[PDB]
Design a protein around this nucleic acid. Sequence first.
DNA 1: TTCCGACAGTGGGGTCGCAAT
DNA 2: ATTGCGACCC
DNA 3: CACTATCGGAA
Length: 386
Amino acid sequence: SEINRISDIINSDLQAIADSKGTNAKKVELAKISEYTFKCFVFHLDPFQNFGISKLSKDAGGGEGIDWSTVFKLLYEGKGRDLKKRDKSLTTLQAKIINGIFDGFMDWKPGVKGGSFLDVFPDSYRTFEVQKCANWDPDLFEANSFAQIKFDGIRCVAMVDHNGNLTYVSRNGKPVVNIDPRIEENMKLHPGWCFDAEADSPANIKLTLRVFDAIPYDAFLARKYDVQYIERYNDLKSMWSNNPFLFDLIADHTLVETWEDAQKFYEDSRANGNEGAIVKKRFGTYNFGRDDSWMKVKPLETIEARIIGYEEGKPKTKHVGRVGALIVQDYTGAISRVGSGMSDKERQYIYDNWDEFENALCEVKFMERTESGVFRHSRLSKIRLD
DNA sequence: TTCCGACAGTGGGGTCGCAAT
DNA sequence: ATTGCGACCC
DNA sequence: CACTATCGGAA
Ligand SMILES: *P(=O)(O)OC[C@H]1O[C@@H](n2cnc3c(N)ncnc32)[C@H](O)[C@@H]1O
């Protein structure tokens, strides 16, 4: 049984990367990993893999051992539940490595994830990247940009390959279902194109799309396309001009000469009941990442709340022994959890001097209230007040 | 010397499908 | 059948 | 969807 030789090289590789300090030194050690350590990293990082479980039983393993090929086979097929039923026939080191596949090797903390792994080992697994927006900042505004409604719903990319076959995928490449069938029927007439849109109810009932970008299928897969925004927009309008059904799906935009015009558009959009606005530079290219070619304008409320509780950092995290999240209440009676906005030192102070905070007032920033009345996207702005 | 892009590591509110009751 | 938790939305 | 923290090259 070659099991214990493989569990040792895996445990040795993870410890070697964790002991390396700095990003550069961690990547040169990542290049030296074995076949088996490579496979476990792929199993944890692959965004299109699932296992059905997040941890084995606390019965752990305890001697014996299972063939590493059998383990990798069970993980690849998504049979995590079957693996857990046989978990005590694993060795303890095996169960520690497998639990590390699920939670990210927290026992070792090597400090390398998808960014470092794909840099050292390109194309080890498939990823999905779309254009994302940076935060609104007038200092970065480019003159004569275009303002657009930030539509409600979910991000949805529609890709029509060269055979005319279409798939709807989400922001992270997962399938999207129940789109109006007229939409697929008409888009199949434009093979070799990907359309960036938002899916939402026209108001179960089938969703419709608001399309705001279009990229050729090959350029989309290559993650490279140098046509600027306004030309990309006009190209979409012309290729759909003869199809009125598709043409009406195109989202409108408004020229904003100055950043104060963009702010005015955002306020008009808020007055009409929309979430906010997106500002798009007329010279910006689709970059398949996050940059200021797109910038989002979203509301942000500020309120004073009373700390009424706390929760320690979850097991094996860097926040063990200090505050992971605060429990706050405001004047409406709503109770919301705040998990970010505090420095590491502030998390430790509150944990120790809990008398200073048990019912004191703090300042919380959030986007809006949910339908239940609690905060959406809450964050702490001030631990104490002056 | 500092600024910042890239990256790793935390956390929240909500919906839905399916395995295990 | 319901319950819960994995897996994904924002 | 958020914020903090750290490396290490750009500024
Ligand atoms: P987040 O608050 O970071 O905002 C980005 C997402 O907003 C959605 N969205 C709505 N409307 C648009 C337009 N017109 N253009 C681009 N993105 C839009 C997307 O789903 C983004 O992921």
